[PDB]
A paper describes a structure:
Within the photolyase/cryptochrome superfamily (PCSf), a major subgroup consists of prokaryotic (6–4) photolyases. These enzymes rely on flavin adenine dinucleotide (FAD) as a catalytic cofactor, besides an ancillary antenna chromophore, and a [4Fe-4S] cluster with yet unknown function. For the prokaryotic 6–4 photolyase of Caulobacter crescentus, we investigated structural changes associated with its different redox states by damage-free crystallography using X-ray free-electron lasers.
The side chain of K48 is almost halfway located between the DLZ antenna in the N-terminal domain and the FAD’s isoalloxazine. Although the displacement of the K48 side chain may be dictated by the changed electrostatics around the isoalloxazine moiety and Wat1 movement, this residue participates in the stabilization of DLZ binding. A K48A mutation results in a partial loss of the DLZ antenna, which can be observed through UV/vis spectroscopy. This is further supported by the structure of the K48A mutant, where the DLZ antenna appears to be only partially occupied.
Author numbering: 1 to 509
The structure:
Amino acid sequence: MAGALRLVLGDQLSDNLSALVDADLSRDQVLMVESRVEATAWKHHKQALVLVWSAMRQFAERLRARGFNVRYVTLEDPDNTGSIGGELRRALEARAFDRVIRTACGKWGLESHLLSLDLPVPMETREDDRFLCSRAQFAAWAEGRRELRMEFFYREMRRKTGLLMDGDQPAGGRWNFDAENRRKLPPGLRPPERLRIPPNPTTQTVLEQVSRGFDDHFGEVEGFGWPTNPDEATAILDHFIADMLPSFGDWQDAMSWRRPFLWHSLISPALNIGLLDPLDICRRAEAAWREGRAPLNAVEGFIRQIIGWREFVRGIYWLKMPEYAQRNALDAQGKLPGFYWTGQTDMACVADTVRAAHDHAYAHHIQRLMVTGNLAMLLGVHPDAVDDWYMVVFADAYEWVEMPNTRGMATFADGGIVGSKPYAASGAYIDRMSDYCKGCRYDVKKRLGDDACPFNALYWDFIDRHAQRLAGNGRMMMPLRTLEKMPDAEREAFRKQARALRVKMGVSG
Ligand SMILES: Cc1cc2nc3c(=O)[nH]c(=O)nc-3n(C[C@H](O)[C@H](O)[C@H](O)COP(=O)(O)OP(=O)(O)OC[C@H]3O[C@@H](n4cnc5c(N)ncnc54)[C@H](O)[C@@H]3O)c2cc1C
Ligand SMILES: Cc1nc2c(=O)[nH]c(=O)nc-2n(C[C@H](O)[C@H](O)[C@H](O)CO)c1C
Ligand code: SF4
Ligand SMILES: [Cl-]
Ligand SMILES: [Mg+2]
């Protein structure tokens, strides 16, 4: 009858967390740790550190106001062992407990370590039921499927959640209103100004501590504008729903120089730590369509990203780990170019993506996928180095979501499990979808020579290198038959260009 020690991690800041919902407030204690192991396993963006630790401190205060005894161990505490496991042991030695209760986390290596810890009391691990699909439900869906197609998973999630269902039929009589007709912004359309959250007093304190104590971590911390508690996160969501969602579908794949947010929701950093709930977000978007304040194609496209892609990538991560993290289907062995960290490249699209990561800890999906992701795949950068960049530079990065999007969708190192095909593209794609190329030093109409857009020769050398494997993929027919129709002299020409680019960029050779 000594009570339970209830662990809450930095991405578990939800009243409904499974480790909390049956607490005995008169006997139990919550443990929350600012852990330098977790902060440095990858050296996360300064803004990611500020976000998590500010949000953590405020959640602890919200728990105390509700009657919880909270043992909170800060980054400054001189007795903090630095690790979750060390701090569990320290808490169990400070007073009597009958058991530890925790919620399964979002990183296989940490989950595996915690499951193996030898503690003086039992540890009970509960599934994270903030997600809409359980790990077991995904495994059951996936069983027997030669290929995992997000669309079919998504339809099941629509039926299960009831989102955008009119009786037993999808709203509007189609499941998906996606189409491949998206374009860049018209020249006269200026993306709108976005709501930012000025740091509250707790956030300001953490910002000062991170600026002094983690100066070697990537990124700028001045200008921090992310929400750090439920009120701030709800303000950001309200702004998206009212002001941005009606145009969300039109501009979902566009890119505009030094306009990093466009009409995206900017909620992933808050949702991924628990400050928003995925079902609530989707119900709010559905209500906007049902009340006549947004079109169905925009609302369906937004919901598909949360109950479709987000749940799907989590499902594949837990289905396939730990071997997933060792897959390298294309035998990529190159080094990551230094300009991924410094931004010092004349490729305007790449430079702008690195700039947004540095200044905001954010870039939207198409930029992550088709600029820096595609480039790394075409260069043949080793997947560990690519994962290590995406885990550092964005404030929504956790392995369960980063890895299937990066090792899977963006670079095909998983051989197509997540994405079915490589999302390889030349500069022509970036030119069509962005305003980058007019002002770029390089010429997107050229493949060879010092003025040619590097993506153009790298794209064709990638298709060439992997032509047989992509033939046995079936989803690359338009490019492979273009390749086969080029004369040997044309193919040799772009092979030499791509080889020279990989040496110049510090990748290999
Ligand atoms: C290489 C690469 C790495 C990525 N790494 C991460 C990561 O570490 N963390 C992360 O949360 N997302 C990651 N994504 C997915 C996606 O790019 C981000 O979720 C999105 O950019 C967040 O911006 P937003 O909140 O403005 O989203 P919106 O464009 O407004 O989309 C709405 C919501 O849908 C979800 N979402 C959309 N696309 C995806 C997706 N492919 N996978 C999962 N959720 C999705 C998010 O919850 C997002 O908030 C990655 C994508 C790629 C291509
Ligand atoms: C930056 C950071 N800091 C902490 C921390 O101080 N304490 C903690 O308990 N968790 C932290 N996390 C989250 C974990 O590193 C990890 O990514 C998630 O628990 C994965 O589910 C992160 C990401
Ligand atoms: S020309 Fe090539 S490198 Fe320059 S912005 Fe366009 S796609 Fe990017
Ligand atoms: Cl993680
Ligand atoms: Mg000590």
